[PDB]
Amino acid sequence: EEEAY
Amino acid sequence: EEEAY
Amino acid sequence: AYHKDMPLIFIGGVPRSGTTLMRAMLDAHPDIRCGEETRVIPRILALKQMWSRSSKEKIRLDEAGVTDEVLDSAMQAFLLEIIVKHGEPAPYLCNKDPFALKSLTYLSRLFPNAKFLLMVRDGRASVHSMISRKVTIAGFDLNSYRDCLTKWNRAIETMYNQCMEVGYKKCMLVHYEQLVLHPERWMRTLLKFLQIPWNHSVLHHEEMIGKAGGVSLSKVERSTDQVIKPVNVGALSKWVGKIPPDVLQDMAVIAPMLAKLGYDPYANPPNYGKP
Amino acid sequence: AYHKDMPLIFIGGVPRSGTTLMRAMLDAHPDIRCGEETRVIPRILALKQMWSRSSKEKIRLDEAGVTDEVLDSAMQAFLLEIIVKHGEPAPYLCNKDPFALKSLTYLSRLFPNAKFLLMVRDGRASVHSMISRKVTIAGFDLNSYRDCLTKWNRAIETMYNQCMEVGYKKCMLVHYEQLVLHPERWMRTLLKFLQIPWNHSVLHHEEMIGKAGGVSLSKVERSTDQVIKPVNVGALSKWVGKIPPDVLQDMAVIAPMLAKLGYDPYANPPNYGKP
Ligand SMILES: Nc1ncnc2c1ncn2[C@@H]1O[C@H](COP(=O)(O)O)[C@@H](OP(=O)(O)O)[C@H]1O
Ligand SMILES: Nc1ncnc2c1ncn2[C@@H]1O[C@H](COP(=O)(O)O)[C@@H](OP(=O)(O)O)[C@H]1O
Ligand SMILES: [Mg+2]
Ligand SMILES: [Mg+2]
């Protein structure tokens, strides 16, 4: 996500 | 889908 | 009236294992409504599972106040709205989405009085069904019997282990071959397991098709052409002779769940039993 | 007490556009709680959006009884459970998730009395911020100012168009530069737009950090170290001189939203104004 957004 | 399942 | 402690029924299993027949037979009971596959339930459940598995993401959600208890409450609210509103009301609501039981243990936690029915079919029958009928499933390469059996094995094992974890009072293995061979015996056992009183109309599901308090169908679902017929033993062993010999030789290695679930991996076909 | 018709506030925009500051300023209002970024809200909204865009999939869900009305009820219940339960209760509930406003029009339909704040910042400032601080956003390539300004452009265009569609009573464009240059002027306009009484504490958000009825921060959110400080004009044009000259030359081609939003695409920097 993962990513910060 | 999208696939069937 | 509906809430998270209501007695829900969740039918599932790997696709092409008689899940539509199971829910159609229960739908034929006048006090039970299951309805057609929602589709959204497996996806939101699988989404939720991706968040909880990542420990990195789980920390970020807990720091935002989006704890397990908050998520569960939102999951509960979402799933109930779908389950309750997508079909007609009934004393006993039911849900059939095959891959929802990949989150069986989690669904058991969200819904304490929910009971589960894991449909189990010979993997060679289910794999031959999806390949021959060209049923598209995510991950399942329909050119390869080896690949599909490997994915069948992985899928059914995950659901089985969860079914076993919750126990015999919450989950029940339902063998497709046994269901079609002895439909009265099993439907009587099933309704006793679900703690719903007996109604003979479950044995005439074909006569309840499209009827009020009966079996609602989807014109775009892949099991509709088969379920409209009465219960028969016609699809027990249509798979035999169609699987390649290298796969047949490796069958126990590819699909060790066959043996665990009482299917002889080297019988072509097994003796499932006779009525 | 909470329901779908309640007066909600949704803050959003492209990440690195002063959305955390915006929500923190509102969190300093004793009657308003916004809290931390939920993270799940944009993802479930995005998931939903994919089902409704696909006309093939929309047919199948409707054939299963999972209609717009059913889905919209399920979404309403899920989103309210996150919004209400992830933070402390308050008269005016708020939600800040930057990309939630990619479903602005949909949220306006789901929540009829909800009001929206679309934060707008000079795209060159947002892109520079996300690149220099290494803030990862899905689809944004942080090794390219060109690619980030293109993705910025597409994102803000989608949200801007939806903001203008719902109209001036439902959505208000809020220019970050104007907010930091004239914080009393704009907070007064915002609270009048939101129909919430004026309270000076919104201008002392740094004194309400971690306090009861104040600003709740996440220790792993990327704006926390800036938002603890008082409002300043220090981040208006840190981007100037940091963008490559090929991208500077192509600015109006890459980001036509700059000019649409009142930013000069060849001023380095524009005259945003002075306090
Ligand atoms: N009335 C009925 N009697 C017996 N089997 C049935 C049936 N209706 C459907 N089935 C079986 O259920 C299987 C599909 O399961 P699912 O609903 O999980 O996709 C099909 O297998 P085949 O495709 O091998 O014939 C089909 O034969
Ligand atoms: N108290 C404050 N005064 C002015 N700007 C602030 C602020 N707190 C946060 N910001 C700005 O908000 C931006 C991040 O926005 P978001 O919260 O939407 O990601 C940051 O830009 P920079 O990273 O360019 O400094 C930061 O400077
Ligand atoms: Mg019924
Ligand atoms: Mg407050």
Residue numbers in the entry:
A (entry chain F), B (entry chain H): 1002 to 1006
C (entry chain B), D (entry chain A): 64 to 338
What text does the study give?
Tyrosylprotein sulfotransferases (TPSTs) are enzymes that catalyse the transfer of a sulfonate moiety from 3′-phosphoadenosine-5′-phosphosulfate (PAPS) to the hydroxyl group of a tyrosine residue to form a tyrosine O-sulfate ester and 3′-phosphoadenosine-5′-phosphate (PAP). TPSTs are integral membrane glycoproteins located in the trans-Golgi network. In humans, two TPST isoforms, termed TPST1 and TPST2, have been identified. The human TPST1 catalytic domain comprises a single α/β motif with a five-stranded parallel β-sheet, flanked on both sides by α helices, and this structure is consistent with human TPST2 structure.
In contrast, the asymmetric unit of TPST1-PAP-gastrin peptide contains four human TPST1 molecules, which assemble to form two dimers. In the human TPST1-PAP-gastrin peptide complex, the electron density of substrate peptide binding area could not be interpreted with any part and any one conformation of gastrin peptide. We could interpret the electron density with two binding patterns of gastrin peptide each having 0.5 occupancies. In one binding pattern, four ordered residues (E−3, E−2, A−1, Y°) in the gastrin peptide are thought to constitute a productive form based on the position of Y°, whereas in the other binding pattern, four ordered residues (E−4, E−3, E−2, A−1) in the gastrin peptide are thought to constitute a nonproductive form. In the human TPST1-PAP-gastrin peptide complex, the gastrin peptide forms dual binding patterns. This is because the total interaction energy of the productive form is near equal to that of the nonproductive form due to the equality of the total interaction energy at positions −1 and 0. In the productive human TPST1-PAP-gastrin peptide complex, unlike the case with C4P5Y5, Y° and A−1 form some interactions with the active site of human TPST1. The backbone of Y0 interacts only with the backbone of T199, whereas backbone of A−1 interacts only with the hydroxyl group of T199. In contrast, in the nonproductive human TPST1-PAP-gastrin peptide complex, unlike in the case with C4P5Y5, A−1 and E−2 at the 0 and −1 position also form some interactions with the active site of TPST1. However, E−3 in the gastrin peptide interacts with R102, R106 and R123 of TPST1 through electrostatic interactions.
